Structure formats: structure tokens, C-alpha cells
Known about the structure:
Lysozymes have primarily a bacteriolytic function; those in tissues and body fluids are associated with the monocyte-macrophage system and enhance the activity of immunoagents. Has bacteriolytic activity against M.luteus. Helix content is about 30%, strand content about 5%. By secondary structure, the chain is mainly alpha-helical. Sodium ion binds next to loops.
Amino acid sequence: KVFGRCELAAAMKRHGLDNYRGYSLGNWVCAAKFESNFNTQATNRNTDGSTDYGILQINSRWWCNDGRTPGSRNLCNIPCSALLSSDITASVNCAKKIVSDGNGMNAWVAWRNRCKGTDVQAWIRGCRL
Ligand SMILES: [Cl-]
Ligand code: NA
């Protein structure tokens, strides 16, 4: 599923991400924009052989099991494929656990490089929430 901007903002708000750990909704939408272009089916391979999955590009090195990342953790305890569903629930729950592990949203490179310190509220302007 390729979300519309406001559509994803609303699905995200409903799943408890607005102001989660102090990160306003614009942050999550901005990160999703640049991690996945709002596409739940996005996958990207990393140099170390781990893979990033879904709307928020969650890494199999630590967070999900994909059966092809030797020595990795499965800290969200899910198959990585569940992160590709059109239902963003699993991606959201895993993201909450990530954002809470000490480093906040800096875990997302694209957030760090393209969202942090910008006007993220712009990402939810116009939306009915
Ligand atoms: Cl933080
Ligand atoms: Na893993």
C-alpha cells in the first residue's frame, strides 16, 4: 500500500504516535516519507547483509526475523514480513520500541538527515486529524 500523506498521519495518530516519547506527528510522517516514500512494501538491503523493511524501514539486524541475517536479534519478535502489510500496526508497535531504546528517532538516518531540525508540522498541514 502506498499511503497518502494525510491518510498515513491519521493512521499514525490512531496508533498512538502523536507526541510518542515527545515526537510530534510531523516527525513520524516526515521519516516515513523519506524512508519509504509512504510505501509499506519498501525493502532495502544493507552492506552487512541485513535488510530494511516497510514504511519505516526497520532493520533485520536488530528488530525482526527474516531468516537470512546470521547473528541478528529479533527484538520486536516478529517476522520482518509482517512489517510489509498494508496494516501499519506491527510497524508502529516495533517503532515505539525502537524510539524508546535511548537514541530516539536518531535510529532513522533519513529522519536525522532530512527531518530533524526542520518544520515537521508542515508534513501534517491541511490534514483532518
Ligand atoms: Cl528523544
Ligand atoms: Na533479525
